[PDB]
Design a protein around this ligand. Structure first.
Ligand SMILES: *[C@@H]1O[C@H](CO)[C@@H](O[C@@H]2O[C@H](CO)[C@@H](O)[C@H](O)[C@H]2NC(C)=O)[C@H](O[C@@H]2O[C@H](CO)[C@@H](O)[C@H](O)[C@H]2NC(C)=O)[C@H]1NC(C)=O
Ligand SMILES: *[C@@H]1O[C@H](CO)[C@@H](O[C@@H]2O[C@H](CO)[C@@H](O[C@@H]3O[C@H](CO)[C@@H](O)[C@H](O)[C@H]3NC(C)=O)[C@H](O)[C@H]2NC(C)=O)[C@H](O)[C@H]1NC(C)=O
Ligand code: NAG
Ligand code: NAG
Length: 492
């Protein structure tokens, strides 16, 4: 596997077959796949260098781990996007040996400049990925280059982890499966050779080529994008609150949730040992003191969710893992770096960054742990989304203005095909995904139809009022968030 961890350095070598057996179209699906792996590899904030080599009769180095810019993702993506298939128009053979001996020489060059004795050289782990139909036809057996590489890297039983070779045939084209399989590493328990139909199938496979198990620092908003990973792996900030409500780990001790959900309190966090999770006690609970559901009741608004926000300090720290991680909060320095945004960004800038469109795809997690889909409505579409509460005359018998219930404190979704949260889904993250990282923009507070009242009913199209969903917007809650968390999290 390609290991995602804080110790050491990762050199990733991306080898793109531009031989005569591949069209400029095959070649573009290689570039598209390599691009994705780069963006995914740069999502974890680890020390990584990317080499980019296209190859046919001979190898062409577009980017080298010896160059500083190989640690810079913009330089990498651009070195990659300036790859022309036609640069190999004069030697269209498939010389796999020479492509790998190209990586061998880069490694020899690097060891030379660093010194084979230094930790600079020796802590580097190396992953080669060839994107090819695998039909070598010149240059000799690539095994000669793989063995030179195993030798310079002093790969022994104790150093198996320092080298992975992948051979991946991605797209329409006819693939030699024996060449691929003979290319990739031979490690017990894992595959290094794949035949995949598009870049979407690469996305999923790439998730399982990564080993993130020893990534246990507090990095926020990191998750599993595999359809085959568990629900918790996909959303590890997600916690269960038994006062049922949901919540989100925002740190290694603190959990964000809804006030309306509230010694006997339990919080179930993710745990890699069990789908069952792990139970924690609360040490301290901070409930916004503006929250009071019946505050407008005597005046005809029978439930009011203004300031529906609460924080839980767990009684012990969570150990971070594939199953327990904070989500990123906007307006923190950590969110800033995950978004790759300029350093002096403001909270207004994060809001613009994350919620710029009039309809923003977002998610909340189901009772069963499934990730469900919503579209957050912004600007003039926020008004129309929110308007429908005038249909709801039992809860809101005396509503003069929409804003007496749906204030500026709420996000709005639940229109058209959106899912709608259920009652026990309250307090959980309303989140989104951007550059493979996860940001909490709101928390489930209330709405007009409860689908669960595993199984969700869809409202009848004739039901009044229609489903509609209102989430406490975290960009509206910064004073209170800062007041309780200024020493817990690093606010812009
Ligand atoms: C129906 O809702 C409206 C809108 O909030 C209420 O009237 C508002 O009340 C506030 C004071 O609480 C006042 O400053 C506003 O001018 C007024 N808005 C408008 C546009 O009318 C109603 O509140 C009740 O009605 C009278 C008439 O305003 C108030 O004097 C009174 O405080 C209040 N009634 C009581 C004793 O609760 C509200 N109607 C009902 C039946 O609650
Ligand atoms: C998305 O989730 C996948 C499903 O969990 C992850 O793939 C899992 O990765 C684990 C760590 O690499 C493997 O763990 C085991 O750990 C030991 C280490 O010493 C190995 O030897 C074991 O052989 C290995 N497991 C066993 C007992 O077979 C999991 O096997 C592996 N599972 C699958 C289905 O591939 C992905 O890493 C994850 N992706 C991301 C990006 O987080
Ligand atoms: C291939 O050969 C011709 C003739 O020598 C040359 O003009 C052309 O630019 C070459 N193409 C590449 C990619 O070098
Ligand atoms: C969880 O619920 C979703 C949405 O209702 C559903 O489609 C999914 O299959 C459910 N999962 C299980 C475990 O059946």
């Amino acid at each position: 596997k390609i290991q995602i961890q804080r110790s050491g350095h990762l050199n990733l070598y991306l080898l793109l077959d531009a031989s005569q057996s591949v069209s400029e179209n095959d070649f573009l699906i290689f570039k598209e796949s390599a691009s994705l792996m780069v963006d995914r590899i740069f999502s974890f904030e680890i020390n990584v260098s990317v080499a980019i080599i296209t190859f046919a009769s001979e190898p062409k180095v577009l980017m080298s781990v010896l160059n500083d810019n190989s640690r810079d993702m913009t330089e990498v993506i651009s070195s990659l996007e300036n790859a022309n298939y036609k640069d190999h128009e004069n030697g269209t053979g498939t010389n796999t040996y020479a492509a790998l001996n190209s990586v061998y020489l880069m490694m020899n060059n690097q060891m030379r400049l660093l010194g084979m004795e230094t930790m600079a050289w020796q802590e580097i782990r190396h992953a080669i990925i060839l994107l090819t139909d695998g039909k070598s036809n010149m240059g000799g057996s690539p095994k000669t280059a793989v063995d030179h590489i195993r030798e310079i890297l002093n790969i022994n039983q104790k150093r198996n982890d320092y080298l992975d070779i992948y051979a991946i045939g991605v797209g329409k084209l006819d693939v030699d499966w024996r060449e691929l399989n003979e290319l990739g590493s031979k490690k017990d328990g894992e595959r290094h050779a794949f035949i995949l139909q598009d870049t979407k199938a690469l996305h999923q496979v790439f998730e399982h080529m990564l080993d993130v198990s020893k990534l246990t620092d507090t990095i926020c908003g990191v998750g599993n994008m595999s359809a085959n990973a568990s629900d918790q792996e996909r959303t590890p900030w997600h916690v269960t609150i038994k006062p049922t409500c949901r919540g989100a780990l925002i740190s290694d001790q603190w959990v964000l949730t809804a006030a309306h959900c509230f010694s006997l309190w339990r919080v179930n966090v993710g745990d890699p040992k069990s789908q069952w999770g792990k139970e924690f006690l609360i040490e301290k609970a901070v409930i916004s003191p503006g929250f009071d559901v019946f505050a407008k009741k005597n005046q005809g608004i029978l439930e009011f969710y203004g300031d529906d926000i609460a924080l839980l300090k767990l009684a012990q720290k969570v150990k971070m893992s594939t199953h327990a991680r904070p989500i990123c909060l906007p307006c923190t320095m950590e969110a800033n770096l995950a978004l790759r945004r300029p350093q002096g960004s403001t909270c207004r800038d994060h809001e613009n960054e994350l919620l710029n469109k009039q309809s923003v795809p977002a998610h909340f997690v189901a009772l069963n742990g499934s990730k469900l889909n919503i579209n957050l409505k912004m600007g003039v579409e926020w008004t129309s989304c929110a308007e429908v509460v005038s249909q709801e005359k039992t809860m809101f018998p005396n509503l003069t203005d929409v804003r007496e219930v749906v204030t500026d404190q709420f996000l709005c979704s639940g229109t058209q095909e959106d899912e709608s949260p259920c009652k026990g889904e309250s307090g959980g993250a309303v989140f989104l995904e951007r550059r493979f990282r996860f940001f909490q923009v709101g928390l489930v507070s209330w709405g007009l139809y409860n689908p669960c009242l595993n199984s969700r009913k869809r409202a009848p199209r004739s039901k009044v009022p229609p489903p509609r969903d209102f989430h406490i917007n975290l960009f509206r809650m910064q004073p209170w968030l800062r007041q309780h968390l200024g020493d817990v999290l690093n606010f812009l």
